[PDB]
Amino acid sequence: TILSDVKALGQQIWLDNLSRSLVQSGELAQMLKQGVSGVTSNPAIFQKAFAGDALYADEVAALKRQNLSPKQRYETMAVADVRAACDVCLAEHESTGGKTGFVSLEVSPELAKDAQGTVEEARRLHAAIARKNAMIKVPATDAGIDALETLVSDGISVNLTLLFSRAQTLKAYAAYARGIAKRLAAGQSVAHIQVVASFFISRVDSALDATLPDRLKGKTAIALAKAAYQDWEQYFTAPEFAALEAQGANRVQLLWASTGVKNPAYPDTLYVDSLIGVHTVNTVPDATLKAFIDHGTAKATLTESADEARARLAEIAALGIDVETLAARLQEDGLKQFEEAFEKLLAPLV
């Protein structure tokens, strides 16, 4: 079980897919037996599930005879799938005292710039799921980071997504800390609040590799992740956070997302093999999970050769590539794609 070797190195592997049949077939439970320890979804994942999974047909027909919006029909079916996956993951969650075994459901992409509307929908979905091991997924726009602070102060666990920027990630940590501080000032618990920061990998290489010289192709995303991990080590060890951790606060954990390899010239396990380190998560598509179980390597690679990663990022800046601008552009493109998938999902539910 290579996933056990990864766990021993301090990283969780989650499945970047969710559907009704994934659960009802027993496939998810069988993955957990191999060492998978969580599940992520997003609007594109759900659009594909609803389009291809036979198990929705009866419920769709029933819901079409009710007075509901298409979005309400979607939410009814997706919440049920999330609850079912949470129950499959509950033993894992309990075995670590609530530190693992999460399933993520994303709010509507229409809300990405609306902090108050995001808070309201996140609270509603949190209440609808009614599972201690559910996370609400929120894009890390400025409004999403505003919402993160509020939701953390409400005691809600959050998966902050579409991060491509080290600066934006550090802003998210600061908002998390403000929410935790608020709870401590009100004498509230913090020990069960878990937050992950989903930092995207392959899309960075896909955006840049054509413009980069041969020596740097396929290097930027891993280099950026290695630097982000070092930022995390700094932030969460500083005296400010240390004082919160001493009162029971959990650190945010980095979660590597978009770790399926899109370029056939690269090894199919490149992102998983290259980003293993302590106190992190990697969420993988099913084909990548299978490839990693088949021929992946479990080694402590995330903290290897950190200076080389910095040298590469400096060379990329010197070539006139601004990774901050790229991050804003990738976050926008990702929101657009999620909006398009969500609209596509809703159309047949009308």
How would you summarize what this structure contains?
The PDB classes it as transferase. The entry lists the keywords Transaldolase, Cross-link, Regulation, transferase. The chain is an alpha/beta fold and 350 residues long.
CATH architecture: Alpha-Beta Barrel
Our measurement of the CA-to-CA distance between the termini, rounded to an integer number of angstroms, reads: 45 Å
Domains counted in the coordinates: how many? 1
Biggest pleated-sheet summary:
7 strands, parallel
Strand order of the largest sheet: 1-7-6-5-4-3-2
Class by helix and strand content?
Answer: alpha/beta
- Strand tally is 7
Described by the principal axes of the CA atoms, the overall outline is: globular
Tell me the CATH superfamily.
Aldolase class I
Helix content: 55-70%
Order of helices and strands: HEHHHHHEHEHEHEHHHEHEHHH
Which radius of gyration do the C-alpha atoms yield?
20 Å
DSSP helix count?
16
CATH topology: TIM Barrel
What percent strand? Answer: 5-15%
Q: So what's the CATH class?
A: Alpha Beta
PDB class: transferase
Keywords: Transaldolase, Cross-link, Regulation, transferase
Assembly: monomeric
Entry title: Neisseria gonorrhoeae transaldolase, variant C38S
